[PDB]
Amino acid sequence: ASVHGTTYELLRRQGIDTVFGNPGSNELPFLKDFPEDFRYILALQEACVVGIADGYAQASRKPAFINLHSAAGTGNAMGALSNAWNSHSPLIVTAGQQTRAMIGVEALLTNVDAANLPRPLVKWSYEPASAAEVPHAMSRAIHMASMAPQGPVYLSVPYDDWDKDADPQSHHLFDRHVSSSVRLNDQDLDILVKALNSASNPAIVLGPDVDAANANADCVMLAERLKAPVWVAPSAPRCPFPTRHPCFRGLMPAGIAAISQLLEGHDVVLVIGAPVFRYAQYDPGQYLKPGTRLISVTCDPLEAARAPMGDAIVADIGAMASALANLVEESSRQLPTAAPEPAKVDQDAGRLHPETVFDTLNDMAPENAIYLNESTSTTAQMWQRLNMRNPGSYYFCAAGGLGFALPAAIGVQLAEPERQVIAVIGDGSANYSISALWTAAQYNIPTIFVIMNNGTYGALRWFAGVLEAENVPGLDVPGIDFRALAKGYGVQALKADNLEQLKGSLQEALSAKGPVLIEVSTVS
Amino acid sequence: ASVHGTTYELLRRQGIDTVFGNPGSNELPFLKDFPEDFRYILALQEACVVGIADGYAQASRKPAFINLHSAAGTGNAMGALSNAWNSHSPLIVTAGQQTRAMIGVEALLTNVDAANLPRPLVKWSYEPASAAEVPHAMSRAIHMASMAPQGPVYLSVPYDDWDKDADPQSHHLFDRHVSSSVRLNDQDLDILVKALNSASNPAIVLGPDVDAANANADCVMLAERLKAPVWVAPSAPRCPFPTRHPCFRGLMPAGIAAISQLLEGHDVVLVIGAPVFRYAQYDPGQYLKPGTRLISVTCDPLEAARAPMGDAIVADIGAMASALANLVEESSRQLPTAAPEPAKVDQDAGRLHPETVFDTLNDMAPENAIYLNESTSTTAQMWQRLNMRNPGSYYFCAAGGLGFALPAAIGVQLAEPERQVIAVIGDGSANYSISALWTAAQYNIPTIFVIMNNGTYGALRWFAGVLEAENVPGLDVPGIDFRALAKGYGVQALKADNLEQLKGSLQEALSAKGPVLIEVSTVS
Amino acid sequence: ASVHGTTYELLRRQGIDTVFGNPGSNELPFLKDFPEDFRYILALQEACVVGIADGYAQASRKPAFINLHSAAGTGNAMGALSNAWNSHSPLIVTAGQQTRAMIGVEALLTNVDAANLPRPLVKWSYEPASAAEVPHAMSRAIHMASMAPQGPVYLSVPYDDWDKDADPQSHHLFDRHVSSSVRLNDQDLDILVKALNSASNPAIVLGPDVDAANANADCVMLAERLKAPVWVAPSAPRCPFPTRHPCFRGLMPAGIAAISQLLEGHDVVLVIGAPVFRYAQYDPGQYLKPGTRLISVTCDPLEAARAPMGDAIVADIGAMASALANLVEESSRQLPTAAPEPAKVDQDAGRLHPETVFDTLNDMAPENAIYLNESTSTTAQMWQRLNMRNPGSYYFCAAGGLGFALPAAIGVQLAEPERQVIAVIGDGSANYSISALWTAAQYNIPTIFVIMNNGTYGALRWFAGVLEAENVPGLDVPGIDFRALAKGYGVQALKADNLEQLKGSLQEALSAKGPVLIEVSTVS
Ligand SMILES: Cc1ncc(C[n+]2csc(CCOP(=O)(O)OP(=O)(O)O)c2C)c(N)n1
Ligand SMILES: Cc1ncc(C[n+]2csc(CCOP(=O)(O)OP(=O)(O)O)c2C)c(N)n1
Ligand SMILES: Cc1ncc(C[n+]2csc(CCOP(=O)(O)OP(=O)(O)O)c2C)c(N)n1
Ligand SMILES: [Ca+2]
Ligand SMILES: [Ca+2]
Ligand SMILES: [Ca+2]
Ligand SMILES: [Ca+2]
Ligand SMILES: [Mg+2]
């Protein structure tokens, strides 16, 4: 068998049936004779390709396979890879290399020092020393991406390898099962359980890896058992807990002082599936106040090592969440104090307040909708105003890199055809990966895109303010007509200039059969 | 003085007055109090930012300064950097980093292992160990980018560095002059000149570093003295010779065998400012026929080292071409005769053949027009049909990475306000950096964009045909309305469905006030 | 508190009380005011420094802390790091950097691009962005080295950081506890146990990570319950099983064909704590014969990924071995029979056969002796001829890099004062880290070094034979007087030219009060 035949058999045998790509000449010998049990999903730019694959992998909780063109195609995707590294997304990224006989002269399309290109944003980066080694290298990539902590991997393949003979012994790769579904040994687990049972005022902090493991329901039970308030860790890439559950306290502000303040008085704080912590703003203070002890459960040795405080357990989030939920005692303490309701902001008949938009979405959207957030100045209000009951209901660029939400929303929707995806994106953020719109139209993926148009990089103006920074250039982005861009890529488009048009536009969008973009005029 | 003030003084004193960027919070402390004598050029995505800067650098023959946002911004720009490396473009790429206090815990927006991110696509990549080091590091970046062989460099700066005190001894940096304007020693140069004079059938091959050095006229004189035919080196990123000069033989095919054959019978072949050679397609054969010796003058040790044949001299293209042009004897051989005018292709009333488009451009465009090419299936035709008399008349993605031409064309037009820039771009290639249109609209940069629309990845269909590769997915790109995309970003748009409409469109575009996009229906 | 004081407090609080080092000016500010509760072990060359720390770490089953001088010092130690990478040795390598103010100009002793220097032989490599970050960085280093899979890490520290103020919040770092003592979830573990119980002819293969985890006794219980033969995985860096246990089958030959043949007819093969597999020689064939299924338990994701066959489980060896040993049934099959004693090789009154040496070592050495092996041509006979009943009884350079055993023997003896360490080292290998002898003499570490002198690079002459290679230079090393070398560094030296002298020498060495070298004349 050829490297080509053996490689597709490996992918198939390992559950891969979809290739997200943008093609090039180094990739044609791989893409030729494309098997009928595979589908290829085309996007017009590599950030869009990876972004879509990323959404797909996160929502489906399975690895996604990607094919890109040499260095330029790989390079165009590196921004998306930075997000993917932060979200522990299992992405298998392959790039075509020049034919081996032409690598030495550095012919055009040669990916020079290829394995170094995507570093440091990948768990593993590699180019095989021979054609017969390709299926083995593909095996490694698959497993490296899939083992905890999950993440993007990179494989470069000289295009003449595909037609060479495969090692007959490659058949051994086909059914390899590799598991990292592990938890803390019985002895130390019981110690942890006693600490949780003995705490007088415990708190729970949940991260994106909970939602990735679909450990949400086990965490609910755990929180109910302990009667503990539940926070989502800062800079949340996903939503790990029902946001209207009695225990839920909301999204932590991404500041050192703000967080030690929030956890004051809690004797034991259990963090699960989050870095400790993904701070953002400079907010100097204490990591923890005295009297507070912190225990972190993470699937990532890098997270365990860099936490500046607390104990850590490196283990599978699914296995640990399940064991803990079923081992801890039912506490007779009182549930946390009901959270206040978010205020209704006064709305005139002009441009829309973000809060008006979120209140209206929360009224009209289905209970199992899935939201994506790339409206960077409105995150806090979004978390306060959207009731998200189910797992896998929220995505936000995990490295803060814009250009994620628009293509990711397509990948999510492709992964969850029965759940309505609604992407809330600022006019600024919309541009980074605008061309992803075409993929939604072409394949008829019925994502809804709500563009929050206030003419400016809102978040940057805000930071500029608190910084007292005057005469900063480049903060405004006037003169973009999103209905026309949507038309350009074949996507139905609406406009909402006021509350009544917003209601009407959403009503129409939910009823539509394909993708729809709504430009909303929002206040400055 | 602050690091901030000192650094802008260094930039200013080293000739930099323009900043190409897409802002982020790590960058605000740098961008605040933006000097009134500086200009900031906003682009909506980082591939676009760098593409514009690249075009500006290549046309101005001076370094361009870029400011990107941490890892995600840098990552988005890496495809554009692949091109810039191959074209020896002097780009100073700066990226904002988290405040030093927050790097350890890897807060959101921390650029991890930052110097490694852009490798291997930069000459030098660095993050200063303290704030007072920043001006010096910036000084290193400026010179590393500018010295032969020019190319992109990378500087990461923790945002808290800008308000710190600068070392007063930094003033020594302001006026440093660094030169690599060197040429071969007299003794060996005389030996070279003698071999040139003694050649009975010399040939000359010119690459992009000739045009970068503005060494075109010297090469014309050299060619006239030697009575030698002149070829452009394959995969040409620029045009180094007037294309209607009698010595001109056109663009070499990017094949090993094709090139040895073209050179057969030429006893001495002098290559100036080109890799030897940027082959592309698989065309196995002899590098040189017996009877041919090759001599290469290059500014790049990496090029001199990887050449599979001939002697090399590593030196400045401007200094070498000027020496040789002035030292060689006037040969008494007959001047080569001009190559044949290209054939007029039969154009019916349907869709436009590419040949028709180029003929029409050549007829109607000003004699000092500047062309950019990202119409990948039509490059050969373009080289044959455009009379480019002047230096800096042509640009093509140096690494073959798409998404270059559209932003670069804006950068070039900004660098040459008196020369009409005309970018010819395939419907496929247009999408990669589509949002760059907005910068042209916003800064009133009257670039003309000619979209060759045949609804397919044409060059890939062709390659798939030569490989006889069947069932390749992802080659077609139907359903893109380019006039709507143009309207989306505020740029006037026109359509041309036949030759007659192309003429009216072209005439209207040339007289138009701002940038114009013309969507042209072409054949397959 | 200064960074100095906070760092030493961190080290003591994390159980470190020893520093292995070779000092330089960049390290003086660290090494000054050296705490009275710490000891410093000096070695004369960095390969020896790291070798000694490596032995100490592997024998103690705890991290060892190393301090080297800048780049030159780190570089001298990279050979040793390659062994340490392969043996999963938890080594904390710190190196002194130039003062921050002088890094820019690359003053002498500047470690340029320091974090890249030791790559790719480290798990984590880093230089902090500020002095206050140093304790945190050091905390990250300790845990990165200590978490499974254990391995070497690198930290570069500018020498001016030490006297700066530490962040008071660094106190949270002191008592951090990080665990990776995890095992397969209950349901999947039950499934593995069923497969083991159900096997009709199981075999067990053990790697160095069993011995590192001290899972030897659990592995014995497991082999006894399953009634299964036990092999040590090829290229063994440690001994994970009593070599005279009736189940023991010896060291596996390091070849693909040889191993599948060995495993033929075994329906289930369980591999614990080893790469699958560390083949060495070319010996192509089937990875496994049909009818054979392989299940691998490994602590290293990179191992699980690159296995060309079998399933894998990534978990802590100690926890997994214990769980498996206690859950499997007692098989009704008969217990394997002990391997026959090796035959006595005939020995005349002249030079010694290696076999004679090993038989004699075995007869005279204490039952709890510890052997190190760097006699490369005699490894197979060594494994057959030494009864090693207890854990931690054998060490062999894990990457095949010579220069390990001599210094490592000293580290092991230091970690195990009550177990006699005996190093068996070829005359070739002894030279790589010859100066380590001095450290044994100075600190009175009573290691016994046995030098096998046959005047040649024996294993290389052998390979030259099987390649049929002729006229290979550099294979002989005549003219070295090891007794003089020992004298040179203050180590008592003895000679054994024949069997009688060997017994006399060994007797004297085994009761000596300090280190002893015996130069043994062995046969060509
Ligand atoms: C690739 C990339 N470039 C730049 C940034 C920095 N950045 C953070 S927020 C922001 C503005 C986003 O504007 P918009 O999408 O309109 O949302 P708004 O802040 O106005 O609500 C930018 C440019 C980034 N995070 N990623
Ligand atoms: C970033 C990047 N992605 C993909 C490619 C591969 N590629 C080379 S040519 C080509 C087709 C370009 O199509 P178009 O612009 O419509 O020009 P045409 O071939 O039809 O003349 C593609 C996708 C590339 N070179 N760079
Ligand atoms: C640092 C290093 N250099 C070279 C080698 C290659 N090598 C393997 S075995 C060997 C010979 C060792 O000779 P000796 O120690 O006398 O043992 P013998 O083979 O004679 O039994 C050499 C040089 C190596 N493994 N590591
Ligand atoms: Ca906005
Ligand atoms: Ca096309
Ligand atoms: Ca020897
Ligand atoms: Ca003794
Ligand atoms: Mg890189």
Tell me how far CA of residue A496 lies from CA of A223, B204, C133, in angstroms: 41, 63, 50
Chain A residue closest in CA terms to C299: A180
Ion ligand 5: residues, CB within 5 A, are: B 426-428, 454, 458
**Nearest residue to C22 via CA among C62, C68, C58, C54:** C68
> Would you say C293 and C310 are in contact if contact means Cβ atoms under 8 Å apart?
yes
> Would you say B439 and B48 are in contact if contact means Cβ atoms under 8 Å apart?
yes
Chain B contact present for A466, CB below 8 A: no
Per the document, the length of chain A is 524
- Collapse the DSSP code of B135 into the 3-class scheme (helix H, G, I; strand E, B; otherwise coil) and give the result: helix
Chain B residue closest in CA terms to C156: B129
Select from B103, B119, B140, B161 the residue whose CB has the most chain C CBs within 10 Å, as the one to mutate to test that interface. B103
Contacts of A159 (CB under 8 A, 6+ apart): A25, A26, A27, A28, A29, A30, A96, A97, A98, A99
A1-178 CATH pick, 3.40.50.300, 3.40.190.10, 3.80.10.10, 3.40.50.970: 3.40.50.970
CA C377 to chain centre: 19
Residue A248 backbone phi and psi in degrees, to 5? -60, 125
Tell me how far CA of residue B493 lies from CA of B490, B496, B498, B516, in angstroms: 9, 10, 16, 6
Stated in angstroms to one decimal place, the resolution of this structure is 2.1
Q: Give the mutation target among A81, A358, A460 for probing the ligand 1 site: most ligand atoms within 8 A of CB.
A: A460
Per the document, the length of chain B is 524
Chain B contact present for C341, CB below 8 A: no
- Collapse the DSSP code of C455 into the 3-class scheme (helix H, G, I; strand E, B; otherwise coil) and give the result: coil
Q: Which two tokens stand for residue A188?
A: 């130390």
d(CA B427, CA B408): 17
Residues A439-478 as b or e (16 or more Cβ within 10 Å = b) = bbbbbebbbbbbbbbbbbbbbbbebbeeeebeebbbbebe
Q: Running DSSP on this structure, what letter comes out for residue C167?
A: P
- Dihedral angle over CA of A355, A360, A361, A362, nearest 10: 90
CA A449 to chain centre: 17
d(CA C486, CA B40): 71
**Nearest residue to A142 via CA among A264, A231, A314, A13:** A13
Report the DSSP beta bridge partners of residue A296. A271, A312
Q: Where are the alpha helices (DSSP H) in C104-172?
A: 134-146
d(CA A89, CA C178): 24
Annotated binding site: which residue ranges of B?
Answer: 116-117, 119, 427, 454, 456
Which ligand 3 atom is nearest residue C427's CA? 16
**Nearest residue to B476 via CA among B520, B439, B428, B512:** B428
The verdict on domain B179-340 having CATH code 3.20.20.80 is: no
d(CA B480, CA B486): 11
Chain A contact present for B457, CB below 8 A: yes
Select from A27, A78, A306 the residue whose CB has the most chain B CBs within 10 Å, as the one to mutate to test that interface. A78
Determine which helix (DSSP H) or strand (DSSP E) holds A249, and give its type and residue range: strand A248-251
- C-alpha B478 – ligand 5 centre gap (Å): 10
Q: How many CB atoms lie within 10 A of CB B33?
A: 16
Tell me the technique behind this structure. X-ray
| Location of structure tokens 């001199």 | B304
d(CA A214, CA C517): 61
> Would you say A521 and A375 are in contact if contact means Cβ atoms under 8 Å apart?
no
Tell me how far CA of residue A180 lies from CA of A102, A496, C179, C210, C302, in angstroms: 40, 48, 15, 18, 12
Contacts of B390 (CB under 8 A, 6+ apart): B242, B367, B368
- C-alpha C280 – ligand 3 centre gap (Å): 14
- Written as one letter, the residue type at B113 is D
d(CA A517, CA B199): 68
Tell me how far CA of residue B51 lies from CA of A102, A473, B23, B445, B488, in angstroms: 27, 20, 16, 15, 20
C contacts of B115 (beta carbons < 8 Å): 113
Radius of gyration of chain C (CA): 24
Tell me how far CA of residue A333 lies from CA of A201, A267, A270, A292, in angstroms: 9, 15, 17, 19
| Location of structure tokens 């600068």 | B166
C contacts of A188 (beta carbons < 8 Å): 179, 181
Q: Is A73 in the pocket of ligand 2 (CB under 6 A)?
A: yes
d(CA A346, CA A356): 8
Q: Is A377 in the pocket of ligand 1 (CB under 6 A)?
A: yes
> Would you say C212 and C273 are in contact if contact means Cβ atoms under 8 Å apart?
yes
d(CA A14, CA A175): 7
Contacts of A141 (CB under 8 A, 6+ apart): A92, A94, A124, A126, A153, A154, A155
**Nearest residue to C17 via CA among C59, C49, C64:** C64
Angle at B143 between CA B138 and CA B144, to 5 degrees: 95
d(CA C474, CA C454): 15
Q: Is A377 in the pocket of ligand 2 (CB under 6 A)?
A: no
Residues A105, B403: C-beta atoms closer than 8 Å: no
Contacts of B185 (CB under 8 A, 6+ apart): none
Residues A431, B441: C-beta atoms closer than 8 Å: no
> Would you say A81 and A95 are in contact if contact means Cβ atoms under 8 Å apart?
no
- C-alpha A389 – ligand 4 centre gap (Å): 28
Q: How many CB atoms lie within 10 A of CB B468?
A: 7
d(CA A432, CA B69): 13
- Collapse the DSSP code of B3 into the 3-class scheme (helix H, G, I; strand E, B; otherwise coil) and give the result: helix
Q: Do domains A1-178 and A341-524 have the same CATH topology?
A: yes
d(CA B500, CA B64): 40
Contacts of C235 (CB under 8 A, 6+ apart): C254, C278, C279, C280, C396, C398, C400
Domain ranges of chain B: 1-178, 179-340, 341-524
Residues B112, A120: C-beta atoms closer than 8 Å: yes
Backbone gaps in chain B, preceding residues (C–N over 2.5 A): none
Angle at A296 between CA A293 and CA A299, to 5 degrees: 175
- Range list of β-strands (E), A123-184: 124-126, 153-158, 178-179, 182-184
Select from B109, B156, B442 the residue whose CB has the most chain A CBs within 10 Å, as the one to mutate to test that interface. B109
Q: How many CB atoms lie within 10 A of CB B284?
A: 10
> Would you say B164 and B132 are in contact if contact means Cβ atoms under 8 Å apart?
yes
Burial of A503 (0-12, 13-18, 19+ CB in 10 A): middle
Helix then strand then coil, % of chain A, to nearest 5:
40, 20, 40
Q: Which two tokens stand for residue A493?
A: 């488009």
B471: left (phi over 0), alpha (psi -120 to 50) or beta: left
d(CA C314, CA C307): 12
Chain B contact present for A32, CB below 8 A: yes
Report the DSSP beta bridge partners of residue A94. A67, A155
Q: Running DSSP on this structure, what letter comes out for residue A309?
A: S
d(CA C360, CA A135): 49
Determine which helix (DSSP H) or strand (DSSP E) holds A92, and give its type and residue range: strand A91-97
**DSSP line for B383-424:** HHH----SSS-EEE-TT--SSSHHHHHHHHHHH-TTS-EEEE
**Nearest residue to A80 via CA among C3, B270, B79, B403:** B79
| Location of structure tokens 């441009």 | A351
Radius of gyration of chain B (CA): 24
Report the DSSP beta bridge partners of residue A158. A97
Tell me how far apart the 2 most distant CA atoms of chain B are, in Å: 74
Nearest to C179 among A140, A288, A313 (CB): A313
Tell me how far CA of residue C326 lies from CA of A349, B472, C218, C229, C338, in angstroms: 72, 55, 8, 18, 24
Q: Is A79 in the pocket of ligand 1 (CB under 6 A)?
A: yes
> Would you say B107 and A110 are in contact if contact means Cβ atoms under 8 Å apart?
no
> Would you say A57 and A41 are in contact if contact means Cβ atoms under 8 Å apart?
no
Per residue, the 3-state secondary structure of B173-220, as one string, reads HCCCCCCCCCCCCHHHHHHHHHHHHHCCCCEEEECHHHHHCCCHHHHH
Q: Which two tokens stand for residue A423?
A: 């992407």
d(CA B79, CA A111): 11
Burial of B170 (0-12, 13-18, 19+ CB in 10 A): buried
Residue B316 backbone phi and psi in degrees, to 5? -80, 125
- Strand order of the sheet with strand C203-206? A178-179, C311-314, C293-298, C268-272, C203-206, C230-232, C248-251
- Collapse the DSSP code of C19 into the 3-class scheme (helix H, G, I; strand E, B; otherwise coil) and give the result: strand
Which ligand 1 atom is nearest residue B25's CA? 6
Chain A contact present for B115, CB below 8 A: no
Q: Is C378 in the pocket of ligand 3 (CB under 6 A)?
A: yes
**Nearest residue to A104 via CA among B237, B279, B192:** B279
d(CA C17, CA C30): 15
**Nearest residue to B122 via CA among B110, B100, B140, B108:** B140
Class of domain C341-524: alpha beta
Residue numbers of A between 182 and 221 with CB closer than 8 Å to C: 182-185, 188
